[PDB]
Amino acid sequence: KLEDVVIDRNLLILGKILGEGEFGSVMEGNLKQEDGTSLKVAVKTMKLDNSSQREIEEFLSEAACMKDFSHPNVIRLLGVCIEPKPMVILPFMKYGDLHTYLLYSRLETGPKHIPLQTLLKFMVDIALGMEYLSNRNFLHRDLAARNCMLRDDMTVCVADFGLSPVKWIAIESLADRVYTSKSDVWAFGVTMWEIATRGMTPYPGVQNHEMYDYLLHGHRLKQPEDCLDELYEIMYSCWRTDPLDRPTFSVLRLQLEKLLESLP
Numbered sequence: 001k002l003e004d005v006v007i008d009r010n011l012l013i014l015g016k017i018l019g020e021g022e023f024g025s026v027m028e029g030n031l032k033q034e035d036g037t038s039l040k041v042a043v044k045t046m047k048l049d050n051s052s053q054r055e056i057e058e059f060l061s062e063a064a065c066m067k068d069f070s071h072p073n074v075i076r077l078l079g080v081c082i083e084p085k086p087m088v089i090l091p092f093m094k095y096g097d098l099h100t101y102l103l104y105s106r107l108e109t110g111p112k113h114i115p116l117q118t119l120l121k122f123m124v125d126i127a128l129g130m131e132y133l134s135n136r137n138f139l140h141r142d143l144a145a146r147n148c149m150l151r152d153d154m155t156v157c158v159a160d161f162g163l164s165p166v167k168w169i170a171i172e173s174l175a176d177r178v179y180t181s182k183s184d185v186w187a188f189g190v191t192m193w194e195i196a197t198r199g200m201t202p203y204p205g206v207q208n209h210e211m212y213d214y215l216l217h218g219h220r221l222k223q224p225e226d227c228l229d230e231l232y233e234i235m236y237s238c239w240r241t242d243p244l245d246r247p248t249f250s251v252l253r254l255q256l257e258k259l260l261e262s263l264p
């Protein structure tokens with residue numbers, strides 16, 4: 001398990017901090033590869049509960065499982081490093097996260113106004129990434145626009161740069177410890193709304209502490225102004241009270257492809 005993913009620490013050069021949290025940090029870095037070239041990397045350092053070997057074993061098991069994953073809409077895991085501090089090595093993406101990109105697109109110096117066709121392709125990319133993980137019974141647990149990364153060819157891939165998200169958490173997950181693929185589907189619906197609104201924080205006028213009661217009374221994210229009824233119908237189906245009534249990522253992906261293909 002260790003031998004399959006662990007990269008020698010002297011092959012990694014650490015740079016500046018990109019982001020910092022309570023249980024981790026994201027840093028820019030250089031990784032010397034097998035072919036003798038150096039690749040630009042994003043290094044996610046994680047604080048593990050070292051009071052038992054349960055977290056390090058579960059960490060290495062997930063890393064060994066991820067190494068074998070290969071999909072264009074899922075971030076590629078290059079390997080891991082141990083300084084007992086584990087480090088996740090991922091490719092560095094100059095276009096950054098999708099949430100920041102959507103916000104820059106609304107400003108003059110940032111990318112040009114994103115058309116509807118491009119917004120929907122961002123969604124199809126995430127759905128394709130999530131369909132791949134859902135098929136291998138892998139739970140994301142932190143799906144949001146901030147965790148979706150833009151590759152150099154402008155394709156979107158799913159990642160987890162979280163360093164610890166009440167407004168993305170499924171109603172059943174707020175009531176109980178319960179978290180399934182249908183909870184990732186709820187978070188996807190919220191991720192879609194973030195894209196459609198070009199980076200708005202979910203539920204304007206609603207506090208984080210009011211969220212459970214707000215959802216319990218049947219209220220959901222409102223339809224955005226420039227949003228097609230067919231698109232809002234897809235994101236709303238992600239927020240059905242009973243998780244069983246929510247569509248699979250496979251169904252969601254095809255609905256989005258069919259809707260994207262019907263546009264000029």
Ligand SMILES: CNC(=O)C[C@@H](NC(=O)[C@@H](CCc1ccccc1)NC(=O)c1c(C)noc1-c1snnc1C)c1ccc(C(F)(F)F)cc1
Nearest residue numbers: 055058059062063066075077088139140141158159160161
């Ligand atoms: C608990 N597990 C989660 O909560 C899922 C979550 N994992 C983590 O946050 C952490 C979890 C580390 C851990 C701590 C204690 C016990 C066990 C494990 N593991 C990575 O950071 C990671 C690893 C180990 N190997 O690769 C990546 C990452 S992080 N971003 N992309 C990759 C591939 C995750 C990872 C990857 C994705 C994806 F989009 F597919 F890339 C989505 C969600």
Ligand SMILES: [Cl-]
Nearest residue numbers: 198199200201
């Ligand atoms: Cl905003």
Ligand SMILES: [Cl-]
Nearest residue numbers: 203204221222
């Ligand atoms: Cl709303």
